Amino acid sequence: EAAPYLRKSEKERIEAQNKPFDAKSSVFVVDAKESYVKATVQSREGGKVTAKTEGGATVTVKDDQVFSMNPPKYDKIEDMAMMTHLHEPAVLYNLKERYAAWMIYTYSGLFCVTVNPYKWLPVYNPEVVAAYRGKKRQEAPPHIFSISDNAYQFMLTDRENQSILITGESGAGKTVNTKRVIQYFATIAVTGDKKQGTLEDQIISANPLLEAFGNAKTVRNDNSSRFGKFIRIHFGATGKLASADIETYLLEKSRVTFQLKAERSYHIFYQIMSNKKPELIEMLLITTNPYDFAYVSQGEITVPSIDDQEELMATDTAVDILGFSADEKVAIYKLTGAVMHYGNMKFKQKQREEQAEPDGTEVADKAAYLTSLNSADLLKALCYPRVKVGNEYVTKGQTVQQVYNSVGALAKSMYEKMFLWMVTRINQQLDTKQPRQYFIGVLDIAGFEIFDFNTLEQLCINFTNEKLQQFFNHHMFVLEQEEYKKEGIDWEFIDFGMDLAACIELIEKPMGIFSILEEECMFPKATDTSFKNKLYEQHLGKSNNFQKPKPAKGKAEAHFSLVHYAGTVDYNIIGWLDKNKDPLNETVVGLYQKSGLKTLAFLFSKGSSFQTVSALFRENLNKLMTNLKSTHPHFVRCLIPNETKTPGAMEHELVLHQLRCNGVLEGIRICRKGFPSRILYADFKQRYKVLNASAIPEGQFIDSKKASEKLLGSIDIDHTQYKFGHTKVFFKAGLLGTLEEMRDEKLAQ
Template sequence: MSASLHDNIGLIPVLGVSAQLTSTRLRCNTSVGTPFWMAPEVIACEQQLDSSYDVRCDVWSLGITAIELADGNPPLTDLHPMRALFKIPRNPPPKLHQPELWSESFNDFIAICLIKDFEHRPTISDLLEHPFIRQIQGKEKALQKQLMELIDLHQQMGTIEKTRHERIHTKKGQGMKSNPISNLVNTDDLATLEVLDENTVTEQLQKRYSEEQIYTYVGDILIAVNPFQKLNIYSTEHSRQYIAAKHTANPPHIFAVADTAYQAMVTYNSDQCIVISGESGAGKTESTHFLVEQLTVLGKTNNRMLQEKILQVNNLLEAFGNACTVINNNSSRFGKYLEMRFTSGGTVMGAQISEYLLEKSRVIHQAPGEKNFHIFYYIYAGLAQKNKLAHYKLSKGQPPRYLQDEKITMMEEIVTNYFYKVQFEALEQCFKVIGFTLEELGNIYSILAAILNIGNIEFTSVVTEHQTDKSNIVNLEMLENASSLLYIQTDELQEALTSHCVVTRGETIVRPNTVEKATDVRDATAKALYGRLFSWIVNRINTLLKPETFQSDDADSTDKGANIGILDIFGFENFKRNSFEQLCINIANEQIQFYFNQHIFALEQNEYLNENVDARLVEYEDNRPLLDMFLQKPVGLLSLLDEESRFPQATDHTLVGKFEDNLKSNYFWRPKTVDLSFGINHYAGKVLYNASGFLAKNRDTLPADIVLLLKSSDNKITRQVVTHPLTKSGNLSHSRGKGATVPRVRTPQHATNHSKTCLQEKRQLQMPLKKSATHNNLRNSFRLPQATAEVDNGDSALNPRETTNMKTQTVASYFRVWHII
């Protein structure tokens, strides 16, 4: 680089930027250059009239070139040049991709070249005194010889063509395209296509899919098309190939997403997040597996047991939280946020899981063609193989009520199923590796077996001269089995199922339950036990995977590290018959879609407008009005559902009528020929919902008599799942009720129902996303907020009234209080 001055006019040929200096201060405010090498102050001149720069912009370009020589590409080369123009002024100064491979003096040389404030950046003359430059004095001829040898070597190896975006050169804020470098007919990045419409995208994806190329980039996003077969692209060799590699160096891959998040976390010491979204059956769960596997490789640690524990977590949660549906044999029936924790040096040191919206209703009822949670089939087959069915009071004859379907008529079809046996063995290995004790394992099996026996309890009406609405238990053997497995008194369980307490004017009155009421109590008990057991398992996993620095709660710890989170929620669903569960799932997906729209379209385009960038705006469908229809108060769909749930005489018919009278929106419609149904125009298409059972599922009531009875259990886990308080989103807290130090949530008794729990949990998913900054692959630096627990202060013991969902707070109220739209 050189500079010549004549009559106060200088012409500076530089790396990527050329300018004319017209002032006596040797500064300019015009530029022509290539974005990747442009200094922040040069880019600022494009939009800020009072900005200027001097010859020290060459020093920045020199630092970028040094990185290019070491890494093979300049920083941000994976981005479109126009996006690089926005990233360079906002991002921290770039560094070498693997600084540990280079000398300390070279790293320091790059660091001082890339000081963002050019007033503090050294000049070329200053750089000549840097140790990295001074060390070559007297060695010029030897270095020249080495360089010539390297040139000859590379000429023998041949030229490697790189696929890059079209070059854009800037001049006074205008974009000028140069000739395209590569043929974009079959590209691995759809953002490089000149024509980008729906047909082009689908044709490209279909063509790549036919060639078993299931991964495709769209700028910062990775599209994964489910191949429904095993592909040989996840081997150890492939894993190594994507470690610390540029996106352009390898074909698109899920491993590249993991590496990008990991490198960003280590480089900037900031939390990252990978958001996985898609319809049910799209392969989100498998993608999560691959991400976790690659992140454990990247965060290599000497503690092999920790790595194995983290890898086993997904398998364990799938057994308890996944089930077979009509379109997916391994469908996630809960939302999951897995947060892997790393040291500042990038070594994995632990993990934490948050679970959302477990579909508890599946325990007691499955739609035609669907099954219960995997775990029930696994333990039946596994315990049968171990000859332990009798120990857990499980029969080999007729299937339990909760496992009956048109395909399973005899238990022989379950206990002889080879796949179930293999999965049970794998499940026990998961428990062992993660660190569960044999006692805990036995207690878990007891609760699961108790749930199946509870479902087999049958009731009959007792008609006497003065009593016509009393119920009695027909099969006392099932009652005894359930009480034995839960370690509670049989007569007390019978009383809790067939009667309830009412407090009137300070006097407690015991009233009998009808058969219908007793059946509801039975099913509610089964759902509550399973939901709380699932939360207990998640909490136990978190305890066993908690980093030692967090175990000790050392506030003075200097290395707090950083996290990489993976958000995996259930996919959008549209079945032949859609019920309350599908509505909750689809509202959650609407929230994720809104987040996607905001960060991919709205915020980016607002940035263009604020920076006066002449860019064509992309049209997209904003689903905010639909979310308003769901979430607004007092006439949003969930508010109306809560309101109707408070009326004892309300029915599903009156609920649908209330929807029709109040939801005046193009997104809501009522079919004329289908009773008890309503339709929603979701972002993914029209969905027809059957409102039968909406109110019952939303209320999700459980009598306090059952709660008090379970608290008296001699089974440690059974006692814990009802003694520990619930978080605001209805999950089990780590702390005990009376010992909890978190504040009590002041929510009216009548407002506690499942729709609010649904809404509150979805709100927990969205709040951190809103606060975080967007990075590649929909990654965002965020951490889920600490759950606030509601402390059980023992009121029910003094006033045994009916409670709702064991004091669970609801999602609807949470969304309305913390509205993010």
């Protein structure tokens, strides 16, 4: 009643599992509205099988889509984690059975997997939440509350840091549940001690502006955010709660470079550029028309019904809630205005001469005004730069492309900087002379999504995602080996982190794939086709998991085909190489440092210069990864099972692919090799004694081991189907299945 679904019955658990069943009947078949449906063998054939489906028709299917399924005992369990048959549909339908049971909290890895319920339930209500810490995993009903709970007691003794990691889910439920996560942080505060924005509400202070700030529109998602944020929480206290960080991580500058006409821009821009605030628009030296700024214009010209007048008002609401000055903050978004003005800047190339050279432009004068530079200062000092030290020397004649790239780079870097600045004061508003000794953290996205059409940066983020999965895998590898140790057993399995890292390694040698791309970009005035050819020599023979894409529909050309934890995904080339190109000039900020605005010092401040750009983006990740290596990570993966966020029912197929994207699926692929399985003596034998038909006294006249050796002596001798564990018993997925198959067959006879 309290937790009414969440532990649903003693009686019904039995009686459901009591219900009639047969595995050898109960089979997999492939569907137009599920990829797969539970099935019956009508008949079996060479490389096809003859089938009927519970709801639907009789159906004719090849062998490979099929096996008979883990029976009611399995059917009512808590755990994908304790699987006993591995094919995706099993997992999926079963959790769908949770969903029709509405049974919330789902487990694989050692960790819990999440769905926005789209409905009222008082999951929150403290009867569970306060009254107990709860339990380690096996011991209590599944809940995200667990993961926090045990991470605490773990750290409490351990006293080094941990973060909990929450995947995809890129809109409503993701953020709602992050909120509730900090709500449970408040519950931890209440647990620790008890006797100024509220701390969730303090994060809310950030949320609306920051949400506009780095949200983005996917073809398949409509407010989705392509910063990197990471959330930290910090303890000088193990009392009631101590205060928190949200932090600075991979940000996607290239989006400023480009959009397709279906697609839109960093939401800030789109929001501000609406019409409502009468003074700013001219104060901004701006036309309310997006249409003007081609570099802005590149996208889709609106989102029909996300109402940016009110969203403007919300931005005001937040910036005023900053308690930070109007004049700076106005100048600050005005910086962005300048940025879009830079899209207009366009240069021209003279006779008998290669230089790119000026359009003499009110745009530059707007810049001068806003900057408190003079435009001529730009014109001479940038547009033919100076760099030398030890003597000092001047740089002239840039190509059209050189200029265009250069200025875009500057603008982008400036946007970046502005984000970076936001840290300083926003956090300081958050920041406290209450100490921190120790840290617990939150992350939002291991972000991978698909389009029929693709662009490098996205793939790079996907690379980073799988890298995160490296981290997942090798930690599990270690821990599971500890579980081998736990009941006396010796490792027959090798690093998953390494194993899939090899798949990354195809991307990464001391040669990076990215590295060589951006590297060769310095080879000038040449065409991606050149690299195509270099692919075709370099990888296309060699690197097994990468492929020439097959013919397929939807697309003029696709160029790369390679294999991923999510499955296997194929992607395409426009000549964009230069987009990643980073120009630098000292001079630009160098003089801005002179300028009036006094944003500029924080505006302003060996590894590389004007180069290494995607590798820089590696570097940014890399540090993060390094620091995470210190930690214990914790894990949540999160789903819209539905067409929508609605009480309305499942939409399967994206849930399929999300789960492909959510490691549990091929993680369980990885683990099934483990015979990843531990089942306790007493229950097990309490079922199993039957065939031995043997009486020798309980207690240790027989161990469970002995009783096994006898029953096995009737039944099996194997390692792979089973091995002994010191307290609990270990199996091929199939094996429990056959065990109870025996049990029903024997008891019925």
